[PDB]
Swiss-Prot record, chains A, B:
Protein name (database record): Lactose operon repressor
Species classification: Bacteria, Pseudomonadati, Pseudomonadota, Gammaproteobacteria, Enterobacterales
Annotation: DNA-binding region: 6-25
Residues annotated as domain HTH lacI-type: 1-58
Purpose of the protein: Repressor of the lactose operon. Binds allolactose as an inducer.
More info: Removing residues 1-59 results in loss of DNA-binding activity but retains tetrameric structure and inducer-binding activity. Deleting residues 340-360 results in loss of tetramer formation, but retains dimer formation, inducer-binding activity, and DNA-binding activity (if residues 1-59 are present).
Organism in which the protein naturally occurs: Escherichia coli (strain K12)
Effect of residue 17 to H: Broadening of specificity
Subunit structure: Homotetramer.
Length: 62, 62
DNA sequence: GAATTGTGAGCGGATAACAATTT
DNA sequence: AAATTGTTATCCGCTCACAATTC
């Protein structure tokens, strides 16, 4: 109930939603500054991956 | 687990993914000929209808 | 015109690459 | 050149629309 998208995390962090995909997967081209902000945002919004959209798009991850 | 998609069923029945979805949904534009072929094909590969994808495809609502 | 069947695009989301800027 | 950040395009099982064919 009331999930959190990777979009919410980006919006709060003040970065592009792709910046999250980066920290989540391609840590490359991701400075510690931005990385730390995204990681912290995951707790702020209480990031709960879109079980429907993620499983669909190709990111079930258990 | 093998997440069989409507494409896998359509490929087995020799139909379209739209046809498969029409059979799974049981709404309109579906003939009994293809319906019984899709229900049979989805039984071979053990197709699991994704309700999450359905919610998304039909515009994720609250 | 509607139904049937197939193809294309979108839903809302994510992933990857490219261009520009900084170091 | 490499790293960093933002942006565009494509992909995902499913649904809708469009196109073609048949009724």
């Amino acid at each position: 109930m009331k999930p959190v998208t990777l979009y919410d995390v980006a919006e709060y962090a003040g970065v592009s939603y792709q910046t999250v995909s980066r920290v989540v997967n391609q840590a490359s081209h991701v400075s510690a500054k931005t990385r730390e902000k995204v990681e912290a945002a995951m707790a702020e919004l209480n990031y709960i991956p879109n079980r429907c959209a993620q499983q669909l798009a190709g990111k079930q991850s258990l």
